Subunit: 108 residues, 3 copies
């Protein structure tokens, strides 16, 4: 029955097709979700917000003022959650860069 | 002479009568103060502010914007300091829930 | 060729003449820069901003709202970056206190 959570065309299937770099080989994996989860706890943010569009949207709001001075860890976290937001919104992005384009396009 | 800091009806005596849950058995102990202290240091906040009404009020102000997305650790910290604020204000709350009621009632 | 980075009258030479306390003996050393660097990473702030006037200015902006409730670690970090800002600006401060005077004087 496990196969119900890994349906073709579903969120996890989509996640694992998205490329890290706009013109790159490597793709998002389960370990990127696990890592994003740990990071939010270190930042005293509820990791359960990763599960929904609205939760990802609120996280991205919390993190946005910190982006400009933020370390690489912080920018990577923001980029990862932007991709998760697109997956939950069923927006068909091919890479991290398109996810960022969509998010800042939405904020307009 | 130690008994001067644990006077009947004093702050520590009151602290240790307050219940964690509105309808629960367990009560606040010294270890909850110790834990709140460690947490504020992790957040780069002066733990000495726990000693006064005004310091607890300023901490609660710093933490309030983080509550909505905050982890359980963060909410627990806020709840604990809300109870400490009530003790320092000599407001006779019976549990964490009444402390929260009083704090947000005061902010009106 | 290493001597090109430790020119007399240059930034590192100036740094290591500045006194920690307004009327004190001890002076800023390399370990204070190393420590400030680690601290910014713990705060998810890009340590590379320590390298420029503008980066130090942005860090000080990020940290300023946290100063009033901040722990000693936080105040020490702010004080150290204020001195670095003065060195990068070629402002000839003799101690931490003069650096703080200059920074808040500039913000007027
Ligand atoms: C419900 O749909 C049952 C179908 C059979 C599920 C098989 C999945 C087994 C996965 C093995 C563990 C993976 C270890 C890498
Ligand atoms: C001043 O008021 C002196 C009165 C005697 C103080 C007795 C307190 C002793 C506490 C023992 C340590 C507690 C260990 C759990
Ligand atoms: C370029 O200017 C070459 C001049 C010679 C450089 C000598 C510096 C050596 C430093 C020794 C390491 C310091 C260990 C405490």
């Amino acid at each position: 029955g496990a196969r119900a959570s890994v349906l073709s065309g579903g969120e996890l299937d989509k996640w694992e097709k998205i490329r890290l770099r706009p013109g790159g080989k490597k793709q998002y994996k389960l370990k990127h979700i696990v890592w994003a989860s740990r990071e939010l706890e270190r930042f005293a943010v509820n990791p359960g917000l990763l599960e929904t569009s609205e939760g990802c949207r609120q996280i991205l709001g919390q993190l946005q003022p910190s982006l400009q001075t933020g370390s690489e860890e912080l920018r990577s976290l923001y980029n990862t959650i932007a991709v998760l937001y697109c997956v939950h919104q069923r927006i068909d992005v091919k890479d991290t860069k398109e996810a960022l384009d969509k998010i800042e396009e939405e904020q307009n």
